[PDB]
């Protein structure tokens, strides 16, 4: 059972683990020699372990089993066809409910991650993570633009009264990140939603006029 | 001195040892992850076996294996044979190798670091130059001083905004 993603010793620990359960259930009334009933739990444990501890991404055993039969049926094709199976051949050879789409899909799930410390060039002076960027973290250009946008957007609110701006702050969620509904904003200003709604529209429109003299904020939209 | 024996093993913040998705859509992980998981597999296996109770011979082997694992995590290849992930005869990277060597943190990212605002090009002789002068291609100097020029351009009417200025440069 070696050469399946686990070392002799790791597998042994699993086979012994199952063996204790087998001994706990073995009956001499059957009269079968221990070897007979023991092997069952010895093979099951190691085979289950291989399907439990061989993927960096935990994948169910049943899925692993499908994948295994995919390769089995595939190789059968490969050796018969004298060539090389495709999504659609194996799909039909597999049986019903099996299409080429499903093959490629299952292969996509089966895809395994690779090491970032993998060698680049014959000179072992380069590694994969060296040539992999950071997409997550604020890139000085992105953070700069956000600082500029919020500044100018505020400068646009300075073109409104604090009531108009504050209404927009809560409604759009600039006040405290959380956008507050019109009924809440009318709870803050003690105003009927309709009046709050209309002054919000008036404020947005006033921003539009000021923008029609500036259009500075459009640049951030890009 | 008892601290030289380890009962609680730390685990490095996952960002410092991640499995991010590459442009190809595939993910790529650090060897530390497979080392740490290897320990967990052995540890919980032992915890169960011990809790259940079973012949020492087994437990002995299991405890030893947990040792070997911890050793690989701290300094692989130092003891026994280098731990190798299935497929390649490539030893995995241990915390030590991350801190040790020219590729280690010190001689790679602490004593010397790649820098921004820096370029490179073939050189030629400039007999006309004065001793305190050099010949810098215009496009290089554009990037090199890009932010400074964004400001200067703004001072001028060459650009409506800094973003559109940079997009002009694009």
């Amino acid at each position: 059972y070696t050469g399946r993603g686990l070392s002799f010793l790791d597998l042994i620990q699993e086979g012994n683990q199952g063996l204790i359960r087998a001994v706990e259930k073995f009956e001499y009334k059957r009269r079968f020699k221990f070897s007979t009933y023991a092997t069952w739990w010895i093979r099951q444990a190691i085979n289950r372990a291989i399907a439990d501890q061989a993927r960096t991404i935990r994948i169910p055993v049943h899925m692993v089993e499908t994948i295994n039969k995919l390769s089995r049926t595939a190789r059968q094709l490969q050796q018969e066809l004298g060539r090389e199976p495709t999504y659609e051949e194996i799909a039909e050879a597999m049986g019903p409910g099996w299409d080429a789409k499903r093959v490629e899909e299952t292969l996509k799930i089966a895809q395994e991650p690779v090491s970032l410390e993998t060698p680049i060039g014959d000179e072992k002076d380069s590694f994969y993570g060296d040539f992999i960027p950071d997409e997550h973290l604020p890139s000085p250009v992105d953070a700069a633009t956000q600082s500029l946008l919020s500044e100018e957007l505020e400068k646009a609110l300075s073109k409104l009264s604090e009531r108009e701006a504050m209404v927009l702050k809560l409604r759009k969620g600039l006040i405290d990140g959380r956008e507050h509904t019109l009924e809440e904003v009318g709870a803050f200003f003690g105003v009927t939603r309709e009046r709050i709604r209309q002054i919000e529209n008036k404020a947005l429109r006033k921003l539009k006029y000021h923008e029609s003299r500036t259009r500075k904020l459009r640049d951030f939209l890009d | 001195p008892e601290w030289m024996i380890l009962e609680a093993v730390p685990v490095l913040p996952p960002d410092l040892r991640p499995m991010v998705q590459v442009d190809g859509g595939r993910f790529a992980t650090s060897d530390l992850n497979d080392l740490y998981r290897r320990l967990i597999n052995r540890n919980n296996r032992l915890k169960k076996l011990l809790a259940q109770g079973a012949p020492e011979i087994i437990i002995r082997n299991e405890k030893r294996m947990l040792q070997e694992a911890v050793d690989a995590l701290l300094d692989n290849g130092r003891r026994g044979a280098p731990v190798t992930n299935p497929g390649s005869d490539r030893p995995l990277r241990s915390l030590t190798d991350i801190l040790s060597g020219k590729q280690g943190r010190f001689r790679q990212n602490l004593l010397g670091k790649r820098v921004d605002y820096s370029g490179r090009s073939v050189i030629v002789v400039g007999p006309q130059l004065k001793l305190h002068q050099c010949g810098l291609p215009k496009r290089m100097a554009l990037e090199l001083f890009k932010p400074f020029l964004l400001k200067k351009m703004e001072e001028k009417g060459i650009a409506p905004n800094v973003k559109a200025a940079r997009r002009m440069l694009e």
Binding site: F8, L9 | I57, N61, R64, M65, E68, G80
Partner: peptide, 14 residues
């Protein structure tokens, strides 16, 4: 001893 395999072999070989 250096080979943990041989070790388990002798441990259970007694």
């Amino acid at each position: 001893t250096s080979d943990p395999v041989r070790q388990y072999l002798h441990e259970i070989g007694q």
